[PDB]
From a paper:
Dopamine β-hydroxylase (EC 1.14.17.1, dopamine β-monooxygenase) (DBH) catalyzes the hydroxylation of dopamine to norepinephrine and is thus vital for regulation of these neurotransmitters. DBH is an ascorbate-dependent glycoprotein that requires two type 2 bound copper ions per subunit to be active. The DOMON domain has an immunoglobulin (Ig)–like β-sandwich structure, the catalytic core (the CuH and CuM domains) has the same topology as the structure of PHM, and the dimerization domains consisting of two antiparallel α helices form a four-helix bundle.
In the A chain, the two catalytic CuH and CuM domains are in a closed conformation, and in the B chain, they adopt the same open conformation as seen in PHM. However, as seen in Fig. 2C, in chain A the two copper ions are close together—approximately 4 to 5 Å in what appears to be a closed active site with a coupled binuclear copper site, as elaborated on below. Three of the four copper sites are not occupied, but the CuM site in chain A is weakly occupied, and a copper has been modeled. Behind the possible ligand-binding pocket appears to be a metal ion–binding site coordinated by Asp99 OD1, Leu100 O, Ala115 O, and Asp130 OD1/OD2, with Asp114 and Asp126 quite close. On the basis of the presented structure of human DBH, a possible mode of action is that the closed form represents the catalytically active form, and that the open form is catalytically inactive but allows for loading of substrate, release of product, and recycling of the copper redox states.
Author numbering:
A (entry chain A): 46 to 108, 110 to 592, 608 to 611
B (entry chain B): 46 to 103, 110 to 272, 276 to 287, 292 to 596, 609 to 614
The structure:
Amino acid sequence: PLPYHIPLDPEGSLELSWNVSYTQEAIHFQLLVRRLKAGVLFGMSDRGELENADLVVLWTDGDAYFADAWSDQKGQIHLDPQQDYQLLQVQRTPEGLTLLFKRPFGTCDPKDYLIEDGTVHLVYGILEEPFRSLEAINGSGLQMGLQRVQLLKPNIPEPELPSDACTMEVQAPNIQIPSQETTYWCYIKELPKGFSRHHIIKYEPIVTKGNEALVHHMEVFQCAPEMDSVPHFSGPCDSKMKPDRLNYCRHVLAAWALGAKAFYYPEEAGLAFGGPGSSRYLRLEVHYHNPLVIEGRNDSSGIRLYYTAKLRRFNAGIMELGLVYTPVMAIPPRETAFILTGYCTDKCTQLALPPSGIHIFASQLHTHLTGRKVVTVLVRDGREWEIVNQDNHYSPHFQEIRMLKKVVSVHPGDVLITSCTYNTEDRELATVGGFGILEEMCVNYVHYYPQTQLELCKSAVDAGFLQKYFHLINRFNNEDVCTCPQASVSQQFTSVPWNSFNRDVLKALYSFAPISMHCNKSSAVRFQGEWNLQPLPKVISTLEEPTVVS
Amino acid sequence: PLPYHIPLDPEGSLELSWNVSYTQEAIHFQLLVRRLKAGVLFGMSDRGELENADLVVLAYFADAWSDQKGQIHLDPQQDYQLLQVQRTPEGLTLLFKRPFGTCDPKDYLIEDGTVHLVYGILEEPFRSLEAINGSGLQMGLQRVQLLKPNIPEPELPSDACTMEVQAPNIQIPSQETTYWCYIKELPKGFSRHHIIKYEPIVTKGNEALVHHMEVFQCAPEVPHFSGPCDSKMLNYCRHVLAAWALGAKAFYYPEEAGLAFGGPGSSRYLRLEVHYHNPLVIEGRNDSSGIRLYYTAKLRRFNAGIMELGLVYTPVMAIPPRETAFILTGYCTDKCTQLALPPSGIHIFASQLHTHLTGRKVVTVLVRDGREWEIVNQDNHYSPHFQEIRMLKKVVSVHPGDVLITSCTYNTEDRELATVGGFGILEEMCVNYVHYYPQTQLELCKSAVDAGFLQKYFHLINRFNNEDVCTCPQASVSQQFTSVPWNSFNRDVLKALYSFAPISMHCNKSSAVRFQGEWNLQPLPKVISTLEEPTPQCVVSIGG
Ligand SMILES: *[C@@H]1O[C@H](CO)[C@@H](O[C@@H]2O[C@H](CO)[C@@H](O[C@@H]3O[C@H](CO[C@H]4O[C@H](CO)[C@@H](O)[C@H](O)[C@@H]4O)[C@@H](O)[C@H](O)[C@@H]3O)[C@H](O)[C@H]2NC(C)=O)[C@H](O)[C@H]1NC(C)=O
Ligand SMILES: *[C@@H]1O[C@H](CO)[C@@H](O[C@@H]2O[C@H](CO)[C@@H](O[C@@H]3O[C@H](CO)[C@@H](O)[C@H](O)[C@@H]3O)[C@H](O)[C@H]2NC(C)=O)[C@H](O)[C@H]1NC(C)=O
Ligand SMILES: *[C@@H]1O[C@H](CO)[C@@H](O[C@@H]2O[C@H](CO)[C@@H](O[C@@H]3O[C@H](CO)[C@@H](O)[C@H](O)[C@@H]3O)[C@H](O)[C@H]2NC(C)=O)[C@H](O)[C@H]1NC(C)=O
Ligand SMILES: *[C@@H]1O[C@H](CO)[C@@H](O[C@@H]2O[C@H](CO)[C@@H](O)[C@H](O)[C@H]2NC(C)=O)[C@H](O)[C@H]1NC(C)=O
Ligand SMILES: *[C@@H]1O[C@H](CO)[C@@H](O)[C@H](O)[C@H]1NC(C)=O
Ligand SMILES: *[C@@H]1O[C@H](CO)[C@@H](O)[C@H](O)[C@H]1NC(C)=O
Ligand SMILES: [Cu+2]
């Protein structure tokens, strides 16, 4: 058939399957309607709203007619005089009525939606009641929903597993999530004794059948190699009942977030764990968000690993690009698009990268609720070379590990620039970087080869410069005010009255001020050098991108 | 018959005439080639450079475009549509059509305001487009308003009489640029009349030489003079009855108003200034050109007047160096309009935009209750070298309490220092001269940033780029824009200051007196919102 498919409506009366051609630069959609009552509409839109939508509609109104349509800002449906969607075939089968139609990635028509890399928001609706023309169609009698998907796939078959492949299950024991709002939970598991060295070539999530809903992030780590670690453990990650060490495992075997399905490795590489000289226990950290907050729902959740005995050609690593989690990075309220940027500097890459460089075959983008756009680009001496990963339509609810269509080569001395665009319009206060639900993140997880000791390449604004910012706006408020309060970064940001000047000066600060750079190893230690007050990477540059049927 | 016309090349071997259709949303070009050499190319570009241009080249006719280095390539799409190619006594004429805009974003977009036309004459026979070289290529630009309002010529009062102000059959000096003053006069007595029209008079063959023309009234407080305006034979007869520039057909006052000239307070004597642009330095060329006024004895209902909108002239308004686009905004506040405007309000039928050399874009919008309602005037392609009084397509009504927002976009890329507001050539202006009725006592409605807040700017950036936190002696030392270390932060904070800080408001008559009150530190008008931009709806061979 057509290789990709998803359900649209929960009832499954609507099924969408599609295929992509990058030579023709076009998508072929096939829509299956099993049960058609009244009429049905399908299309795509920016955030998945019915408003400002690029659509296709069918009516039963006659004795069955199909037309291209578009919707305005108020959600009213109008016919499309040109056609972006081109109807190809219509056939009636036992499964239902099938419609094959074709669209280019983009049109010279500016009105239409533009298909590109990253997330695409599909809109579907089932119009319950017969309505005629388009414009009669009302919110009433319309079942109106959205589905998120990646329209442009790498078009590669998922490799699958040799006769050697074995499964290892890393799960929490069956533990009680506190009645607190938010919990981040550490657990210590260990490998069988005398465990020879292996490559994890696959992993998939495991979530208890009542909790799919409660568990929104899971991660599996390795502590520093030099060390033989603490006894067996289940419980929260801040507590001091818990020891010393851990805290020392930032090394990353596995990562899962909402929307991410199973992941298969590229065949050039696998992820190495066990064997001599590289060590220990696995640390599982599970993030529980519990608006529910009722008697402890008992949960053993985790990740399943698929591993092969020994080596594929290269060892694959995972690198964290982005903003460090600190309050000093903040988004003012009532912002339509506000951009936070973080960096991997040439100094860090020069220090931590091999002469050959690394090859990025995958990326996963991560923000919190206010995240809208995420992009990572590659820059060489102030000239933008390549786009590592891009999602303009990105949603926090849909976060998946994507195989890059083109593997990207990163060399020492290159700068990796990561930017996230946020919308704070639903927030009355400044949103700050942090672990909390009301706080934000900008992160790009990169899956690359050959493995290096570089894991966190991240940056943040210099604290001192943020302080002079605060004092600058304070004094712009005039009065006189010789006052030097310290820290309370979250408490300073919440205390700032937000006006055009404060916002613009904050944005200016982010676009100007030097950065505290974090270059850290798998060992959860920095690369020696002085990484504070680094000159802000800047780009001298930018890269340029060029009737009704029946 | 095509209503609008301009010369392109100085030699005058190429002449362009055109027609506008707003239902069809298209321009009809007719190109006249008097002398046909190997080739001719014509088109349009942002500032008038050959690079990145939307073109047509020449019986074979082809649509072309130019790349970043200015090399010419064929256009697979075509915006221009060839209609007719015909041979006449005057030369070879080509009638062709182009839409205002295309769904192709690469192509030029025709809109309100100035359009830069590019022309060339190919000396050398070429077998391709890409073969075209600086060699054998005669290259030029012409600035014009492509979309004119469609105004029918009103009937005349029959009382209406014409007075013609022309050069006294004089000889243009051998110079590239000449400005020529001549003094003409009215009969004595002659009580007040309304000018309801004026149109250009240009001697045949001199079309390329005449760039702009202006008719002025001297100060009431005069001897006869014909010759250059720098000649140092005594006057400022500055103030303006009439203005004309290339491409303009006629200027019409609205049915409600006319411009008054007559017995006192009128001045007695009139001054005409004609601008000759003379590349090639032609010589012994005689010119009678000037402007003809249509005026009536019986006044219409209102007297027409001119109001100055914009930035006050102060150094406090500055543009940092090396900016591609930097925006300065002046304001006419709700308090000023509420006070000085009649209850009925005023109606704006015309506008003239004024900046100095670094000016690129200029826009004036009308805002009601903090919401942008209508665009008074817009030029994104505006140039200081072409500035004319333009009739608005739709007369715009400004009521009491409405806010007028005027913004200019500047390019400082060629400047090493901060450019400041001022009269000088190296300093800047943002001004919109508005022609309206009924005439009121409001003459200058203008604004500027509050000086104190600018002081807070200088001390804030000074204390920020100098490093430490929390120290409070604060001795004040440097107050002015020169000597300032411009980096992204300083620029952005200056922009923030301009976008935030309250303004010193000038509501003036007389230039020597303000209106009725305390105008310092007025709250900056702000727009919760803005308005929607209208959508651009989505090798030939002809027998001669
Ligand atoms: C065309 O317009 C002219 C200007 O209105 C009409 O008047 C003629 O103007 C010229 C120059 O102004 C007068 O020439 C006079 O005689 C000599 C010559 O001036 C200079 O000439 C040569 C170059 O031609 C130059 O190299 C010499 O050094 C001279 O300086 C001057 O000394 C006089 O002061 C004065 O300029 C003509 O006399 C004058 N014509 C008449 C009939 O008075 C001219 O008539 C117009 N022509 C037409 C056909 O309409
Ligand atoms: C949204 O639009 C729909 C239709 O445009 C409205 O829903 C309902 O529409 C049906 C059928 O058109 C109405 O039934 C009526 O039956 C009588 C028979 O006596 C017939 O003469 C009428 O012409 C009509 O067909 C039904 O009354 C109507 N529901 C209502 C009025 O509550 C719906 O009301 C619209 N809602 C909004 C918020 O616009
Ligand atoms: C509108 O009219 C007012 C008149 O009230 C103009 O105000 C200006 O007020 C200053 C007084 O501060 C005067 O100009 C300057 O005076 C200072 C001394 O204070 C002197 O050092 C300067 O050299 C300058 O002369 C004057 O009263 C007046 N200036 C002008 C040019 O009229 C205001 O400027 C007017 N606004 C316009 C015409 O846009
Ligand atoms: C990278 O560098 C070190 C390695 O862990 C971390 O520095 C510690 O950070 C914690 C929390 O901010 C402090 O309590 C410690 O005092 C720091 N140690 C030292 C020696 O400064 C740093 O946080 C790491 N950054 C990451 C992992 O993003
Ligand atoms: C997409 O599907 C069409 C018919 O459904 C087929 O002809 C075409 O080859 C397919 N393209 C692919 C699989 O790339
Ligand atoms: C302009 O286009 C052609 C000129 O030949 C003519 O048919 C048309 O009527 C003209 N329309 C206007 C409004 O000038
Ligand atoms: Cu997170």
